[PDB]
Curated annotation (Swiss-Prot):
It comes from Deinococcus radiodurans (strain ATCC 13939 / DSM 20539 / JCM 16871 / CCUG 27074 / LMG 4051 / NBRC 15346 / NCIMB 9279 / VKM B-1422 / R1). A motif ('KMSKS' region) lies at residues 266-270. This is Glutamine--tRNA ligase. Keywords: Aminoacyl-tRNA synthetase, ATP-binding, Cytoplasm, Ligase, Nucleotide-binding, Protein biosynthesis. The keyword Cell membrane does not apply. The gene is glnS. One of its GO terms (cellular component) is cytosol. It catalyses: tRNA(Gln) + L-glutamine + ATP = L-glutaminyl-tRNA(Gln) + AMP + diphosphate. The keyword Hydrolase does not apply. The chain holds residues 43 to 632 of 852 of the full protein. GO terms for molecular function: ATP binding; carbon-nitrogen ligase activity, with glutamine as amido-N-donor; glutamine-tRNA ligase activity; tRNA binding. Its EC number is 6.1.1.18.
Amino acid sequence: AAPLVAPNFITEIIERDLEAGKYPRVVTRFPPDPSGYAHLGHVFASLLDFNTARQYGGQFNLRMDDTNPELARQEYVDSIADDLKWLGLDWGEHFYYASDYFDRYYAYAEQLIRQGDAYVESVSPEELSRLRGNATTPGTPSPYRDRSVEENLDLLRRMKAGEFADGEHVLRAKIDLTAPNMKLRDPVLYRIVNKPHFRTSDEWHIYPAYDFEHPLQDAIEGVTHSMCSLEFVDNRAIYDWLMEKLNFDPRPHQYEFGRRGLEYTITSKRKLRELVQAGRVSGWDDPRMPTLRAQRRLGVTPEAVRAFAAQIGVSRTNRTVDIAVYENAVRDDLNHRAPRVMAVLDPVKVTLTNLDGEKTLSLPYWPHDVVRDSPDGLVGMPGGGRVAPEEAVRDVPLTRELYIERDDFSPAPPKGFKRLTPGGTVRLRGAGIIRADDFGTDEAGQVTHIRATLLGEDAKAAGVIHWVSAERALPAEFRLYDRLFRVPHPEGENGFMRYLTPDSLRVLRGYVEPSVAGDPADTRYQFERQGYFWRDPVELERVLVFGRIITLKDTW
């Protein structure tokens, strides 16, 4: 069994620590901000944190970093927990709300104050930045840097009580106003924000800045290896300064890995909101959207998402990933799980003039190569469990009236056309050869019907097409999606609507073979020669709709 996490720099850091007995167990965590729905961009990091804990028999924590009162929403907490569970993450009982620890951060802030390691700044916000300096002009203490412990403790208490307006005061770490790393120049730990919190209500008027709460939360949770993106390299000095000034032992350490942005994809919340607002998408769970909710509805399996994330390399360099790796992971996972069935999306009626009396064909759900590569020599049966390949078949009715795909009949065929043509023949999948004897055409020039004859043994044909009984098939709506965006970098490599793919959603009305009527609602299929499909789960719950999960082959 291949390793859950291929050897990477973090993996090596951990084996090195276990080897030296630095920590008894490994503790990791994924700390999203409940400010929006989980999306494809969160998969890599979350799975890296989870699989790392798992690989080394550690603990994985799921944390809602809801420290910003104006962004945290119950709806994102609910969706994120639900989506990550769907993805396969397992945090057991270790689910945390950073807000549940506001008291703990406050007490640490008081300790820092008492040690003379933190002070209440009361200078104007514009002044704070002016006094802070640059990499070419060292900072200068404001007249409040040297306030006494007593005074700072009293002002912090009143800041918490809401006695002062936003921006009037801030609590700052007392570090080094001359350090070359700007982050060490007395970074802000608390800000006044007179806004209620979706959980703590009107309890707090000061909220911890990221650089203060993040390291503390890690420390309070017992995290040993804190993993974040490269953007927080410089922040590590504050992270270390805090762990030290507060004497945490054992203490967590931060390790940064490069970002892995997915191409042709935009995950920025404000931009995705515009698409929803402008109606270019039905909502946040529109299959074309990058949210996990949209992927769940599109029909993608959690197994495929994990196999995609697993293939992504881990390094300290930022890189992009082409969706092809994602798309292929989806297609490859469905190959062994989606029994093959027939559906005609752009139906044209054909009458088999010499056929009297329905014939019942028994066709196999799976291709030989799938059966061959079966781990247990068995294969899937929609609804049932697994069975011997011989058992994986269904009744397919072959009747006088049929429906074939419009593009499989061509009155004016191009050179090398292998399907049905006037006076020509074609093989009907699992049923024999037919010859087009006649057909009608409407004013718009669309073929309205075809009359054909089922031929005998001598007959030959250059092609094979799917089809469905026009009398026993179930009518259905099919939704065909395409990539939301048409270029690798719709946002640029560092107005985005000029890049929306045209006709990213197409609706067609057709028919699917009847065997489908009995199957479980979550059954996934390969509609022969069309793609992988499954019943749109959302439309099922409303007051027969199939969505196309993905095409049979890359089209870009």
